[PDB]
């Protein structure tokens, strides 16, 4: 969850703690640090629960040295626990790591074979040992550390020091930031800058793929072929303590970095031993719950979309019938109740008049019963319903909508398995389910590091005015959701479309004034909408491709494959979110529109 | 000069000499430093010359400790040589001093007569050989300077320390700043906050009178009793704020309409008896401007269009001669100062680079001096500047100037009558000037009435690419503000241009897609430009007209008279920025632009 | 509760005295005084009673001496009686002492075991043994002192007396107050300065944990470680007054809204529990003061949803009434120092309130001093005879305390908000109106030759048009009366005509449907109705019936937005006029004399 790493004449150990302590507000269950004096002695403190524990654990040692690593950790991989705690050892090698290694069982088995004792249940320690073997083979610390990163796969933000040669640090970025702070004759880096403010302002950041070599006066920089590559120092003329903004431009950009802690802050709680735990609901909960037979959700705008995903979710993984509807449509028809239903309203602030008034009516029509997902506590709609799940996401000033989305598709996937009617012919559903969940922070971290590529992307689409985003099944109403966004900040006109309608009226509009998107598209629907696109080269029509890397897809000179990084299957929708998002987001920049107060736009409708 | 101190767990004579480079913009002609290990042994080292000399000889034989204070030189007391630069010692006492002990040759005999070898001819030694008797009789270095500060008349900083015990460092700022910057487990203090970035950003600013003991871990402030005072640490500065906003959609839009209460606030304390009251200024200051013969001022962006429109003024009320010019071009060329010339600084942030380069090269061309009209406290600008005018509007943060333009104007016609040349006029213009001062706030609120009219007119613009500002006179610098703006916040080609030069260019360029805007002409400058507009009249050019309601203009099919209230001639300049403002906003509003944040743009360049 | 030291050349037994007669409103059973002359020869006299009574004893044995200490005393450990008063003695050593030392108990049996016989019931005596015994030797007065106060818990104000050296006097101040009164060849020190006042009005206030030592000469304020210590563009300041009312009300503001809601704990860490138990509100206040309560009643009514009274201090003060339970006792004043305001405060403390809260604008002043709380309105300096800016930030402090003393359960919530939307909108708004300002001046002109006008208001409007009437009978000596908008018909429309305007404040359609038929009754008379209302409103001006158009607002914040065109209607008629604004005949900024 957060890296911070040290390298001075001077003892960095209250440095490393108060790192940690910058980096708190993002979630974590633990921490730990490791220093080594120049002797060459290591002391490494781990321990469960917050830093505050960590620092007390240090209070009894001279943690002397000018050397160390210090992490806080949210586990995937292994219960929170000081044996699963970074940094993580082999000896004299010594690391510290943010998100997932996804090959994790075939390095440890391969390692366990050449002799190495996993004593932690984490993907990490793959890492330690890895890097310990290619030691082994000789060479300096950079060398072996090249050899060893291509053979990992997944997201990696990772430092790593050797206590036998403290002079020198090795740190690898890919799926994770990492920057680097420059002090006077010592030198730093966290995967966070908040971290480094209390002793310099002067940042490198790394960038995707980057490999680098710290040491008290010296950084260098390359990638995975030891080419040196080089990175620009800058100072960081930011006001820190100025408001709400914290780092960022944008209010909407800040909600749209920070949706790996509010999903974090979403998760808080309700997974207890691999299962979903909605017991806040109360004790007679699962007895409404259990007598469910369908499920209705009520929506407008946003909110409407994550239903909409959810739609697919609940009846393919939980077999319940589920319809999702506008909710001014809602409200204003004769409708007929389906038996047993559970009425859900989805909104963000709470008091969307649309949306209330669905409910209220839903009152008199024979629902089981009314759960509101909502972000406001104390709201119309959490109030005036039966059960409630807040999203917890923190407050959201943009007018558009990102982490309230995200997290309103966190809390709809967990309710998949407290909702399950397969039988089965389950059990692996909810282990699925509780592991896409407890990746997903870093999965989204994950996204938000393809951003420089989104950015260059968005010089496409910065002088159209119609775009057309095409989706499948659970990723239909992603596209649904990136065309709203593109509308919103951007005013370009963005429309959505099941994918396989392109050829019933829209493919007649395309042309160059009209880019396509597609959202993570299978090699089958791949290829029925290349041929589409293919029908019209002529006028200049291009597709633009978001899809998994594995899947080995390639750009022809209509066709653009934006490859991204696999995630697993059930949380692909809210990953391939990200992308839209960012996408719109830079699209605004370069036009330089209000992002944060789209014109005509309201934050909620609250007046009829 | 400068001073610089630090303690520390790590060596401190790179950071001190560091601190030193960063102070060269001021001083000096010798320097030198001092620092201690942890067994006491103080090692001195000092040059007549450049720092880099000092560093140099520091280089090939380095100081070692973790305590330790540095200096640079201008004397006054005694002439330049590594005799009396700095560090002065007396025994184990060593200690560094900026400004002038008054009372030297008295107390210097004193202490003579107590077996005292003076070696230097400096006023600072005596500093050094009675902080050693205090301390001869018990206690430590804090009770002891406690005692010696009174016994020392004039305006100084100190910063003591005794070798005997490296773990203290005791400052005393007398008439000369000094500012603690707080570490990690480290100290830092100096004569100016430019030295200490580096290392640290957290600040404690010393109040004139106090005394500081200053630790590794601590820090304790007193006064010139020895009663423990307590002092805050800033950091910024320039908040925002919410919220602040009010009933207002943007910041910028906010700051346009409290333009009558920031400008209440500039006008406060400023006016009495019917005259311009600026004894804020000093007791001497009637006296270094009544030798003033020329007016220089300095300026970037919307800051030189106020000095721009301030040229009218002095000439033609004052009677002084007056030169503006753009910062960049100013700082680069090789110039022909004027004999007794007063340089002025126009800044809203009061750090622009250009600006500040500009006001310290002037330092070394000989200006009577330097003025400072700046909207940011303790800001660059006016720290360096001899004098400092306020302007008081409050935080503006809107990333185009509106409040700090006018509020700037305001400053500037408030000069007028406190440097008239001209004197017999006279009385009537300070008159009129003060009279106009008085109406002023009002006359905005009656123009901020007009909104919905510029709302309106704003349509006519928001779909063009291209606009032409015409002005005459005091008028033509708020042409170029009125273009600048519609170029900032609206992105439109917007340009401005004297009005006596339309037909020797711009006019080939006049149609449909390039509206004519000119602001408040009299009726034969009007004349002159509607026969300009009737050559283009079969391109369909349009002239838009801001102009008094008393002037009877009649619109015609080409041209659009948008009539005005009337207003004193004296503040008309300040008055018609404010359409042009609204003008610029409403565009904005319409498009759907980012007002607070224009794409491209900064509140402040700082750096180069 | 209450102290009265003095050194001298003269007989300072009368001194000390009246220094007692003026903290009598401190409430107190017993007192006493001792004093020392020149040789010896120290003599003591304490009572159970009134104050008064002691002074009638003292009649008959008239006391000598130029030094002397002495004590009203409300009994809080130990008995009410002549036994336990103060000063108490040990020998030589006399102490008189405010509050409670707390460790008392360990410290007294802890000091018997050496011969010191407790002869009173009271804590106080272990401070009066302690330093006797710590003059076994130990330098002299001052010496021994800073040796006690260290091992002495609890909140108090001791003063020490050594009666072998009649020339100096210790004071200690480790819990309440004491300020020392200069100075002219004797000094003097009061647990008030209001006691010094026949005598000095020269102070230098102890800081907590100081030790002064005071003799005829000098006045040393030790330490407890411890060594030495020691109108602008404007016409007038009504004018400038109202016109920084947005500055005023943005200083108000400050601190004071924490993400999104109102944020007092500048009132104390317990605070905030205290104001929980409020069950009730009860305000008093003078002229304008009572003008701004008034409003407020509405506002903790309808929003807060808890039960409010408010008092014109002069009433409350002179009848018998009838407390409700766990009532909160509110003071509004700009000075802090009105005598009807300050007497009603200290009547209070004897009937059984909560407690008090003091919204004021004056630093340091009485009521602020005898509050347990306060809320400063933070205006800056009110000149102006007549109340403008002090008014207006008395209002948003009392909007920012609606939202403290919520009772609504779950509707607080969103009321919070409300109120914080309102507050955060009030500078802008205040600037919005001020810039009716010239439409006002003109207006001003069908007032100025006039000797009547009526002022209407309904609701939390109401008490808008009090205020608005008397501004003008203020500055501008028209005889202007403000009246319940619902009592018009009731008897004053029989004094309507076209030398008696009338003036509404802010009606809806409704009210507004009422008046006008109320107007057309007084037709034939010329009766003129002048209506300040919302644009939105839509409302169309006839011949009798004038709309003055203003800019929507905020509801929670509209009778402050109201306010602001009252006053300078009442201003610009009073300029026409040429009334002494500042200063208008026979009326005083502050009336603190009987
Ligand atoms: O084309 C318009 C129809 O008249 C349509 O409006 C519908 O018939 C009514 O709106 C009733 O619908 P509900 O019975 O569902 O309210
Ligand atoms: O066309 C370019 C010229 O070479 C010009 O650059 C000039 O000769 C120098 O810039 C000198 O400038 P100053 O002497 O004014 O500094
Ligand atoms: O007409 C006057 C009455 O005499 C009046 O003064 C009242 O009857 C009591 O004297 C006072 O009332 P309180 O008991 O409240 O003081
Ligand atoms: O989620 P709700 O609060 O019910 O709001 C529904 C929609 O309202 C507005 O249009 C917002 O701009 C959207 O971002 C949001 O999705
Ligand atoms: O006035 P200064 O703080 O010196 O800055 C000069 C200019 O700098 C930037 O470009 C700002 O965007 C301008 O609005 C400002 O006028
Ligand atoms: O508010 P206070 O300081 O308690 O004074 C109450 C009243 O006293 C006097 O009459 C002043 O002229 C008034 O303007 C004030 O309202
Ligand atoms: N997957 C690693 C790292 C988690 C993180 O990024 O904090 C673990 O479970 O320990
Ligand atoms: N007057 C001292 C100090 C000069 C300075 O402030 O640089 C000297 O000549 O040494
Ligand atoms: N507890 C002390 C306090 C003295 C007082 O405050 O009057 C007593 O009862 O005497």
């Known amino acids: ?279 806040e609901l109360g004790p007679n909960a699962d007895e409404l719950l259990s007598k469910v037979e369908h499920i209705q959700i009520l929506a407008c705008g946003t909110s409407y979309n994550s239903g909409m995903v959810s739609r697919y979710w609940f009846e393919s993984l939980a077999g319940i019938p589920c319809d999702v509807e506008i909710a001014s449509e809602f409200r204003y028809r004769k409708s007929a109740v389906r038996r047993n239903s559970l009425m859900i309203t989805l909104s963000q602030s709470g008091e969307t008049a649309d949306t209330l008034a669905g409910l209220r009516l839903s009152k008199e029509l024979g629902y089981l019963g009314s759960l509101a997902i909502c972000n406001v506590p104390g709201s119309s709609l959490v109030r005036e319903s039966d059960l409630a799940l807040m999203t917890n996401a923190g407050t959201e000033i943009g007018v558009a909508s990102t982490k309230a989305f995200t997290t309103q598709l966190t809390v709809l996937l967990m309710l998949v398995a407290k909702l399950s009617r397969l039988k089965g012919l389950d059990a692996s559903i909810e282990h699925d389910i509780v592991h896409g969940l407890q990746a997903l922070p870093s999965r989204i971290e994950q996204m938000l590091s393809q951003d420089k590529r989104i950015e260059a992307l968005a010089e496409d689409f910065s002088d159209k005015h119609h775009a057309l985003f095409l989706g499948r099944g659970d990723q239909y109403p992603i596209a649904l959701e990136g065309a709203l966004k593109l509308k919103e900040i951007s005013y370009i006109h963005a429309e959505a479309y099941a994918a396989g309608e392109l050829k019933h009226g829209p493919l007649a509009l395309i042309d160059a004034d009209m880019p396509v998107i597609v959202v993570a598209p299978n090699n089958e629907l791949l290829e029925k909408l290349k041929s589409n696109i293919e029908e019209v080269r002529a006028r200049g029509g291009q597709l633009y491709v978001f899809a998994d890397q594995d899947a080995g897809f390639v750009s022809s000179d209509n066709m653009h494959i934006i490859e991204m990084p696999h995630v697993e299957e059930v949380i692909a929708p809210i990953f391939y979110t990200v992308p839209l998002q960012l996408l719109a987001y830079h699209v605004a920049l370069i036009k330089g529109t209000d992002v944060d107060q789209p014109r005509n736009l309201a934050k909620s409708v609250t007046v009829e």
Chains 1, 2 share one sequence.
Do not use: C
């Open 1 to 279: 969850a957060g890296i911070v790493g040290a390298i001075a004449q001077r003892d960095v150990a209250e440095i490393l703690l108060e790192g940690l302590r910058r980096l708190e507000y993002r979630g974590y269950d633990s921490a730990g640090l490791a220093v080594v004096d120049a002797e060459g002695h290591m002391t490494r403190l781990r321990r469960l629960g917050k830093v505050q524990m960590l620092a007390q654990a240090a209070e009894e040692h001279p943690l002397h040295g000018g050397t160390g690593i210090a992490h806080t950790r949210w586990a995937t991989h292994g219960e929170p626990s000081e044996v699963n705690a970074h940094p993580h050892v082999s000896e004299h090698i010594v690391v510290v790591h943010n998100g997932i290694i996804e090959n994790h069982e075939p390095l440890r088995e391969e390692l366990k074979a050449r002799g190495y004792t996993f004593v932690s249940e984490t993907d990490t320690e793959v890492i330690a040992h890895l890097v310990n073997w290619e030691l082994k083979q000789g060479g300096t610390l950079r060398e072996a550390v090249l050899r060893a990163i291509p053979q990992l796969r997944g997201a990696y933000g990772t430092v790593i020091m050797d206590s036998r040669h403290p002079d020198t640090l090795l740190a690898a970025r890919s799926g994770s930031p990492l920057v680097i702070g420059l002090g006077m004759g010592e030198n730093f880096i966290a995967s966070d800058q908040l971290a480094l403010l209390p002793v310099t302002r002067r940042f490198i950041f790394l960038e995707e793929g980057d490999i680098a070599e710290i040491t008290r006066r010296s950084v260098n920089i390359f990638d995975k072929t030891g080419a040196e590559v080089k990175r620009q120092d800058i100072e960081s003329n930011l006001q820190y303590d100025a408001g709400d903004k914290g780092i960022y431009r944008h209010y909407m950009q800040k909600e749209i970095y920070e949706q790996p802690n509010a999903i974090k802050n979403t998760l808080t709680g309700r997974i207890s031993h691999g299962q979903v735990d909605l017991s």
